[PDB]
């Protein structure tokens, strides 16, 4: 049973950070690349970046960079986002998916995680 | 980067009735190459995560009801809603995974109208 599962919570202070994990399992962890996705109530969903697992290579939104760093460990099975100085308008549920993209097509994701809700308070 | 936009931003429609929804982007998703685009629908029912409905700009993926089905090329795609079910309720996002930044559209919620 493939499965992408987060902590349902983060609480941080203003100016504050946090490191969220998302473990998979079911899965080649190396075979796929993580996605990170931001969703704010009303706004609607937002791509943060993404990064292969077996080299590490990241690619960011650059409405991101420097404000998200992701990293994995191959050894666990987790993959990870920092996200630093947070401010209110960083509070949100953020998810971590997965992209297949055969067929000639797109990458379509097709697995997502429970999701985190971190409010900056 | 694409942008992608959706409308209506909201529809209300009654069990049973047609619903078209509209995605365009500003840039087009096919390749030139493949000849398919990257477009994927995603469907989002309250208090859940987004869940993948169709992909390329057509294939619906399985478990996913042939009510819905995704249309179109370029830079204009159709999700149609062939008879609306109460479970239908929730907002669909289409989404561009051709290539970095992947971004979505904003959103068409679908309301259900009932007695």
């Known amino acids: 049973e493939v499965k992408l599962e987060q902590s349902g919570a983060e609480l941080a202070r203003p100016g504050a950070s946090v490191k969220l994990s998302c473990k998979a399992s079911g899965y080649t962890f190396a075979s796929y690349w993580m996605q990170w996705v931001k969703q704010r109530p009303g706004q609607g969903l937002e791509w943060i970046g993404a990064i292969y697992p077996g080299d590490g290579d990241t690619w960011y939104t650059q409405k991101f960079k420097g404000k998200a760093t992701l990293t994995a460990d191959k050894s666990s099975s987790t993959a990870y986002m920092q996200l630093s100085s947070l401010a209110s308008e960083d509070s949100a549920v953020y998810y971590c998916?997965?992209?297949?993209?055969?067929?000639?097509?797109?990458?379509?994701?097709?697995?997502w995680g429970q999701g985190t809700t971190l409010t900056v308070s | 980067d694409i942008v992608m936009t959706q409308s209506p931003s909201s529809l209300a429609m009654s069990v049973g009735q047609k619903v078209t929804m509209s995605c365009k982007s500003s840039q087009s998703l096919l390749d030139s190459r493949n000849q398919k685009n990257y477009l994927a629908w995603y469907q989002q029912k309250p208090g859940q995560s987004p869940k993948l409905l169709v992909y390329f700009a057509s294939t619906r993926e399985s478990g996913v009801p042939d009510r819905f089905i995704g249309s179109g090329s370029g830079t204009d795609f159709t999700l149609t809603i062939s008879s609306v079910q109460a479970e239908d309720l929730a907002d669909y996002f289409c989404?561009?995974?051709?290539?970095?930044?992947?971004?979505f559209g904003a959103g068409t919620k679908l309301e259900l109208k009932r007695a």
């Open positions: 989404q561009q995974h051709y290539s970095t930044p992947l971004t």
């Open positions: 998916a997965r992209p297949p993209y055969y067929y000639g097509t797109t990458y379509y994701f097709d697995y």
